[PDB]
Design a protein around this ligand. Structure first.
Ligand SMILES: *[C@@H]1O[C@H](CO)[C@@H](O[C@@H]2O[C@H](CO)[C@@H](O[C@@H]3O[C@H](CO)[C@@H](O)[C@H](O)[C@@H]3O)[C@H](O)[C@H]2NC(C)=O)[C@H](O)[C@H]1NC(C)=O
Ligand SMILES: *[C@@H]1O[C@H](CO)[C@@H](O[C@@H]2O[C@H](CO)[C@@H](O[C@@H]3O[C@H](CO)[C@@H](O)[C@H](O)[C@@H]3O)[C@H](O)[C@H]2NC(C)=O)[C@H](O)[C@H]1NC(C)=O
Ligand code: NAG
Ligand code: NAG
Ligand code: NAG
Ligand code: CA
Lengths: 433, 194, 437, 420, 437
């Protein structure tokens, strides 16, 4: 005789067929779980009438009178039979009904948005060289300029008696002053150079080594920036549960009355107590009514979410904006429901194990959770540059102008006080003239 | 035609009959070989070339390996097919036979045996594979004498001068440049203002 | 007796000999199949009359009566003895009819327009940088030049003493005119460098900041140009159906109910399975019910429109803008239908193999496919990079020359009117005096 | 009953199974061509006697003797039956045998080695810029030099006073002569520049525009060179059957008097009569012994070998070091033999068609022709430049040096003669 | 009554207690399964006596008679009714034996030598040009500079009147010495300019040719360095089974016939089929017979060594350089074997479900895996590009500075001992004069 199979309407497990009108009859539920049921029927030999449960539920305990609202409630009344559907293998459910060997295993996993890469301003342009080399180079420039100044004094011939057209007086005077030595260094790093190039030999070796250093630095910088600007491997900040267990820029999530926190409360475990404490603090934007609300919220904010290890796969393989990060946290089982003492328990477990060893279940899973697949996120690195990516140099330039003006007025007053007293009237005339 | 072949390793020569006992190929021919390892050592047999082409059926031509002495007590393996597995001589006495039957054009029987599979490892010997410390001189002797590569396997300024002729043209140019420098110094010191 | 030869009307296979006066008999019909029929009838020495099939289709088994249609039906009931038409060889047809060896093969290949001859870009000097950045750089050049001037006017370490004879440099200007400061700014920006070299720290810091800005801009520009060029070079044009499988920006096509979509649904190979899933999901989003409309859809969009190879050859030879890609997804031949029992099949097979050995049928094919094949040779799509069309316009140089000439003549006129104090008086004398050098 | 099929030891068709223990009966053989036969038996009902031929020989008669040594004998003398093995359906056999409908098609195609990334090194430069622009940049340098000179002469502000400390002199100084303008023009092309900077705002416009043009040229040349050295795609010299003719540099060949020569002989399209004329010209090494030695000599040197399409589609999948340049030239058909007038024809062609249009044939073909596939010749562009990539610049430098010496001595004699 | 449990010696699962003084019976074992049985006893109140199978094997179907051995053999019979040890739940082991719920999850996963590091040579800045051009460049610099000097010392154009306001004097000379020409050449090679202005045709033409050489050399250097960086940055290290399957160089493997490779043997999936095809193509070139040999193979070579997950955890957390790559190819469960007719099956399922609900057995995982699971994480290896470890050799500057100061003091001594014609006379005077100013 046929069977009395029960089933809950879960989306990527059972489905109302696409077309409606030439499809009337209580044999038109299809999906992965339905494929499992049909293959099971073929391998065992029986028929099944797919009657939907009256109340949409996995099943749940009720304290007041031992009520078990869901297919579990009638599954102890023997009014039905083998019920292939999502149904955890928790302790309390096993107390009243028998189970089978799970046909797949899943847990809780982190759902988060794919990195996008609207990179910042100032940092972006000097990002290629790591901040170590930048300060190394500034210090090297200062040191090279200073040692050039030191060797300038020891130099024999830099003393060059200005205007030697008249050798009348041995006016032995200087060049390569410390100020101009630092100027030569800083203008040699940038690819322009001063006109104070060495006129002796010993200093020329320092000049040449400095030139070589500048050329190497600039060429390497250009190469590395052209590297970053055609590969652009985006990186995700959080990559594990403990990682976001200590940050505060990213916010956790959950499902209203969802099993995730029910396990995740009374965790008693090393790190997971922290995030339960956090959601305990702000229990107003953490929770959402159902999975769809969490999907919407993560689509809106920078909102890390905490659903199961399978629905994540289903959602992330059809909407190529999200990404399953981390790994597994817990382990549960999806089996088949049945009353105690039914002859079908071992008779179905052997069949499920046979299929799982044959690889059939893997094919059904792959085919019913495939989707179009991840698209080609490759042929898009053709982006004309904009202020969004290099802007900080303009701010650097503005800082240069303002500091220049301040130093200019400072040196003006320095010369004025070298000339006259603190109160200034003559220098106003000097400015006007 | 039973010819001894014993030691630590060796190659049972491909169709070694022309000099030991030069038999006419018309009559069926067969010659057996006895192998002895070093004291307290078993044997590993690894074919390096084997093709009994004239049939895939064995009433005429084949090669067989027996364990222990050259008796029928327990055939380790007689090989009649395209490919030939490696084998483990449990004892220390080797037995190699080939039976030919007016089919002397057989490609060859050619193998290599390695001793000291039984010997426990010590600082003097070398480990290559599980229970395969075989070293007496066997370390990198030019032969793949362990089960898979491991034993003889990948153990082992003048580069710039060794160019095809880039160095030669470079040093000719160098002589030219030495001539140039020596010429330059002359008018480094010679001429003045006017 | 003579032989009653049936035939189908098809675009490159059997046509009407284009004539004005009314002619009839076995002379209205002219085509490649007619060439084959005439040749094999001369070889086998027969006399034939020609009749079109009335229902006008290949023929298929109508399930409601289990009874043939069109060509197959008119052949089975001995109304006609031969069928020189592209009657495809297949399971259902072979079970009832008798064929020869195929006189050609074919496939199911992909139509696609060649990518518009390596679309060139022009005026692409400034492509790697968005125009806002260019405007910002121009304005910043102006601003930093004028600022350099302003601090070059009010500070102590400005005046330059030219001669080493302790003079007083009471001159109004020493080293910075508006044109000179502006063009020092431009020259420093342009990586060449000028001689107006600062001395006072006030101008030195401005110069340093300006130089750093120039290096950042130029290195960014070079890196962006290399990025664009390597991204353009990296991508490869589709040359297989597997590319159609993995890639999904462009769209497929098919004449559903033409057994091609049926071939894909009945297939079990991975790539064809996934493409069949794609068309099933699209479900007339990318589908076609004929050929010509599919041809035009390809002509108007990135449309694949998989078709049998022979018509693809014909189309890609008549036109010259869309060519087949890949090879042959599937194989199936043609034949010359004959009834279940006919002593003509053996000799027609002998004749077809003969003609193939002499290769004459290849000559007819090239006369009718290649014959209309290449009278409109367009080009060969010369493949190179660094071409003058892409980033090679010199018009900015011409504009610079034009503005230079105008400015030169204008300030020569200024030197004439405002520095010789007479109009049309210093013109001739001045140009005569300055022409000899 | 039982049927005496007949096969042959072709390479990817029917080969001895690879095992260690002895194989007995019809389980010795293994390959595509016999699992086709297994499918045929499953769909029809057979009994196997896979018996090889006397001597490996596709049935091909001897004209003088009139015998048919090969599978044709066992198909005629009834000592066998349908002979499932690659057996070309050709005209001469068809008289005295019966062939089923082909289960796969054929054709003769070219075989060549794909190019490898060793640039000519003579001039590996001017590559990332069309030579049109390389000429235009020089001629535009000449043009800008000339126009800069002209602007310099016809200008009020382009005249300096030598001896500026003495205001009683002439203004002959102009800093722009017949050669100085050209010198500065060339020197601004390369990022150093001379010291002849303009002074009038009428020519410094030319200076600025020239600067912009040269900056764009150089900063695009560097980008293009990096693009070429990063993502490099080499292309074949020859890409069609006709290209082999009217080229006379590749020195192709074929198997000695096998099946290719038979086609090229008597082929009157004349697009391959030049082909045959060149082959028969050098009839000492272009026509070589067999397929193995043929592909060997192809590996040795530039040698566009020419053979049946399926063996190409096989050998170019193992040794991924060659390529099937070109498409198809002819078509044959491998078939299934059967004795004259035997009823198996009409009962076996239907099975072949069933397998063909049911989709198993393509998977059957791929399971044997596949091989390893296409290895990772995609991420390989990590190599330092060498003289093989930069050699023309030193030649240009030597030419410049010798021209410098020549012009120097010439100018020395010029000035000495003018003084004398 | 007292029950009997039979277990197996295993690497992380059931070890013999490590001690010197003798230990006995139930108090001589340690590990995971012992702790699990201890908690089961505390939650159910058993009286267990522990023992091993004299065979000491998982026990499997034996085709000689259809019988079994080990735990399965003794469990179809009755010497014990429990077996707390990893015993894969499979169809053949389920037909006759009765199993509880799986208290852990398994799976075949690959193992790979992790990216060891950058392995940077500090002279990697010198890499993009082969160590043959560099000497060519240096010697060509010498030659070009010396040719320039020798030409500049012999020319009818070069000699120049020095005086700033020169009224036709006779003190003309050139300006080119050896040092001047040499450093002009060095600067031009270095693209930072120079001080000399070539005047004659010969000097200007040689300078132009030299500039062309230097420009192309520098541009090619930058292009090649960018090539290295942007071809390395887009390398994709393996992270999944299929991506591994596409790759070819890294040879595969598995412990042969250890129920792992057989999964590839009987698999139906295409990717695993091509995996197994590669396996059979190599066929004892890479198919290791024992775990540790494969471990050393992966240590000293590139390899995959597909093996079950738990041992991969036990090895990776007990060593370094080895990274769990990918996911879980298959799925098995580690039950607790029991006879068919037994009440303990349901009780023990309830017990282990209670254990798993609290995370207690996850804590056992922590104890026997994680307590020794982070003793070797040296760091977390923050990845980025553009660090001083590559192209950061400042020692060139050190050598330059030390050589410069050495030659400076040497010539300082030279100008006193020789040019002043007497030694020690003007040392202190020189330092004081050049110091106080
Ligand atoms: C990558 O691109 C996506 C797509 O635009 C960016 O998503 C955007 O994320 C921001 C949060 O940073 C969302 O802001 C929200 O806006 C709504 C109304 O617009 C407001 O009610 C919320 O309070 C919040 O401010 C924004 O909506 C969202 N874009 C869209 C179209 O929804 C994303 O930020 C980009 N970057 C990264 C790293 O993902
Ligand atoms: C593919 O890479 C290989 C690796 O070097 C190169 O193939 C080389 O091809 C040339 C001819 O195209 C061979 O030259 C020799 O010519 C003499 C002339 O007598 C002949 O005797 C030799 O047998 C050989 O043909 C060269 O040896 C060969 N290299 C090797 C290692 O065999 C080449 O870089 C790439 N192929 C092509 C066609 O460019
Ligand atoms: C080529 O031209 C057609 C119409 O002339 C246009 O639709 C198509 O987009 C062009 N090609 C590309 C690559 O844009
Ligand atoms: C392609 O070219 C042909 C004629 O050369 C014509 O159909 C049309 O100009 C083009 N069609 C496109 C670009 O779709
Ligand atoms: C690089 O990997 C090899 C693997 O053989 C290893 O021996 C070596 O220590 C590694 N180097 C570093 C710096 O990790
Ligand atoms: Ca410069």
């Amino acid at each position: 005789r046929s069977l009395i199979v029960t089933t809950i309407l879960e989306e990527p497990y059972v489905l109302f067929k696409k077309s409606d009108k030439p499809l009337y009859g209580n044999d038109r539920f299809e999906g992965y779980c339905i494929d499992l049921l049909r293959e099971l029927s073929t391998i065992l030999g029986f028929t099944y009438e797919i009657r939907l449960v009256e109340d949409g539920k996995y099943g749940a305990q009720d304290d007041v009178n031992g009520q078990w609202n869901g297919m579990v409630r009638e599954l102890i009344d023997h009014k039905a039979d083998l019920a292939v559907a999502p149904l955890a293998i928790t302790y309390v459910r096993e107390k009243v009904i028998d189970f089978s060997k799970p046909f797949m295993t899943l847990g809780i996993s982190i759902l988060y948005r794919k990195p996008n890469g609207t990179n910042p301003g100032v940092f972006s342009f000097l990002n290629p060289l790591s901040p170590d080399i930048w300060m190394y180079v500034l210090l090297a420039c200062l040191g090279v300029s200073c040692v050039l100044f030191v060797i300038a004094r020891f130099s024999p011939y830099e003393w060059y008696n200005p205007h030697p057209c008249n050798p009348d007086s041995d006016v032995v005077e200087n060049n390569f002053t410390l100020l101009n030595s630092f100027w030569f260094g800083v203008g040699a790093l940038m690819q322009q150079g001063s006109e104070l190039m060495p006129k002796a030999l010993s200093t020329r070796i320092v000049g040449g080594i400095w030139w070589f250093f500048t050329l190497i630095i600039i060429s390497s910088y250009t190469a590395n920036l052209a590297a970053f600007l055609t590969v652009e491997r985006m990186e995700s900040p959080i990559d594990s549960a403990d990682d976001l267990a200590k940050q505060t820029k990213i916010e956790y999530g959950a499902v209203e009355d969802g099993a995730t926190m029910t396990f995740f409360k009374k965790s008693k475990i090393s790190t997971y107590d922290k995030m339960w404490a956090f959601m305990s603090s702000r229990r107003q934007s953490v929770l959402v009514k159902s999975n769809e609300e969490g999907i919407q919220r993560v689509l809106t904010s920078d909102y890390a979410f905490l659903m199961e290890s399978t629905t994540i796969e289903f959602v992330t393989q059809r909407n190529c904006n999200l990404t399953q990060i981390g790994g597994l946290i817990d382990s549960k089982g999806y089996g088949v429901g049945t009353p105690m003492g039914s002859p079908y328990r071992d008779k179905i477990t052997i069949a499920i194990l046979q299929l799982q060893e044959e690889g059939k279940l893997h094919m059904m899973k792959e085919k019913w959770w495939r989707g179009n697949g991840c698209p080609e996120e490759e042929s898009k690195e053709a982006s004309a540059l904009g202020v969004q990516n290099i802007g900080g140099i303009f701010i650097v330039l503005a800082a240069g102008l303002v500091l220049s003006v301040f130093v200019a007025v400072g040196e003006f007053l320095y010369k004025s006080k070298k000339n006259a007293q603190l109160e200034k009237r003559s220098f106003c005339s000097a400015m006007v003239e | 035609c039973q010819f001894e072949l014993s030691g630590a390793d060796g190659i049972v020569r491909s169709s070694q009959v022309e000099q030991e006992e030069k038999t006419k190929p018309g009559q069926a021919v067969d010659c057996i070989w006895t192998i002895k390892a070093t004291p307290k050592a078993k044997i590993y047999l690894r074919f390096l070339d084997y093709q009994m082409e004239h049939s895939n059926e064995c009433k005429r031509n084949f090669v067989a390996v027996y364990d222990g002495s050259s008796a029928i007590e327990n055939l380790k393996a007689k090989f009649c097919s395209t490919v030939a597995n490696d084998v483990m001589l449990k004892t220390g006495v080797g037995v190699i036979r080939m039976w030919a039957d007016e089919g002397s054009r057989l490609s060859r029987f050619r193998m290599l045996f390695t001793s000291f599979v039984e010997p426990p490892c010590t600082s003097s010997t070398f480990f290559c594979h599980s229970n395969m410390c075989i070293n007496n001189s066997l370390v990198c002797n030019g032969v793949q004498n362990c089960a898979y590569p491991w034993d003889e396997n990948h153990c082992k300024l003048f580069e710039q001068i060794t160019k095809t002729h880039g160095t030669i043209i470079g040093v000719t140019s160098g002589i030219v440049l030495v001539l140039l420098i020596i010429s330059i110094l002359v008018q480094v010191k010679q001429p003045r203002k006017k």
